[PDB]
């Protein structure tokens, strides 16, 4: 038996299918037992049994190609994926993580670890484009799935693979982390739109770690502030967790609970 898997297809995707998919993903990410100021906390990496460490997301498209992404439950972030007979992993940041990912796709005949990490800075560099310039929506995700699949046949060049990772991470991992970002993807489906993320989304993505800390270290929710951006790119400060309730869906574990 196995890590949990959640399925989603871009083919005939609707606001409802996407929403229910993201909700299912969150359910496999947090236990529901650690909630702080109403925001769920992800499992603490320290002491976490390896059989609890990962979940799989099976993505398919209208071209009928499928890939499975692996997400780390401790951060909701993509550590690698499988297509056909091969799995591909980002370079791990430490030896524990390096050891953890060896328990993924153990079924697969070929397992490759990239020489680079999966952080946006590295991926933007490999892609030769910023998040600001990379459109998101069902169309881009449909195409990103094909690109990841054909990486495994040699049909996808590295910069396109980087760009496709940038799309997948945002529409899956960041959507899972932030209701606000799930909402941004919902709207794109509703209107059949593809468009790049605006500054509001980019700053939340960049800030997810800092927000997790501020929230967990707050006095009854009051921060010891975090600067975000509005959609027009103007700066605003968050002082308190209350405003973030509709915004941030889960947090990386920082400190012991109340």
């Amino acid at each position, epitope marked *: 038996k196995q890590y949990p898997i959640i399925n989603f297809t871009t083919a005939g995707a609707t606001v409802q299918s996407y929403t229910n998919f993201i909700r299912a993903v969150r359910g496999r990410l947090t236990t529901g037992a650690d909630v702080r100021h109403e925001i769920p906390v992800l499992p603490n990496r320290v002491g976490l049994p390896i059989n609890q460490r990962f979940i799989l997301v099976e993505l398919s498209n209208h071209a009928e190609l499928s890939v499975t992404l692996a997400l780390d439950v401790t951060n909701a972030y993509v550590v690698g994926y499988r297509a056909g007979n091969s799995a591909y992993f980002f370079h791990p940041d430490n030896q524990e993580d390096a050891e953890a990912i060896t328990h993924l796709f153990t079924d697969v005949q070929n397992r490759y670890t990239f020489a680079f990490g999966g952080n946006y800075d590295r991926l933007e560099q490999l892609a030769g484009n910023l998040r600001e310039n990379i459109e998101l929506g069902n169309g881009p995700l449909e195409e990103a799935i094909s690109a990841l699949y054909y990486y495994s046949t040699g049909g996808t060049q590295l910069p396109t693979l980087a760009r496709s990772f940038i799309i997948c991470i945002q529409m899956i991992s960041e959507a899972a982390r932030f209701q606000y970002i799930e909402g941004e993807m919902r709207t794109r489906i509703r209107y059949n739109r593809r468009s790049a993320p605006d500054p509001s989304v980019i700053t939340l993505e960049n800030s997810w770690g800092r927000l997790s800390t501020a929230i967990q270290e707050s006095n009854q929710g009051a921060f010891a502030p975090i600067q975000l951006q509005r959609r*027009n790119g103007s700066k*605003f400060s968050v002082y308190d967790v209350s*405003i973030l309730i509709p915004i941030i869906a889960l947090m990386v574990y920082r400190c012991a609970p109340p």
Partner: nanobody
Amino acid sequence: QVQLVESGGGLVQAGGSLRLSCAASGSIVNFETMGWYRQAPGKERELVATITNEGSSNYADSVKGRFTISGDNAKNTVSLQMNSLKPEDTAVYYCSATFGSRWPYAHSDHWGQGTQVTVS
């Protein structure tokens, strides 16, 4: 629990100058737009000067180059410097503030109760 506090106004000589100030409390977030509208008696209320969170200002054509608005986002305050006062400027001035999304609101808008400026 938004509250606007307006200061300034009163009787002033033609050619003089004064300052209006407005400070919003009870907004957990900074204003989207803040500024003044005025209503001259027998007239419709009209925009005078507003400023945005981006610090962009908008003025009535008739006060442009006479009035200056400035703002402080972090304190949710705006100030209107009124120079070269003219008869047309006699009116009740109303502070207005609008705020964008913060839970549980998508937005809100707020009016002051007005302060009269009378040019003698």
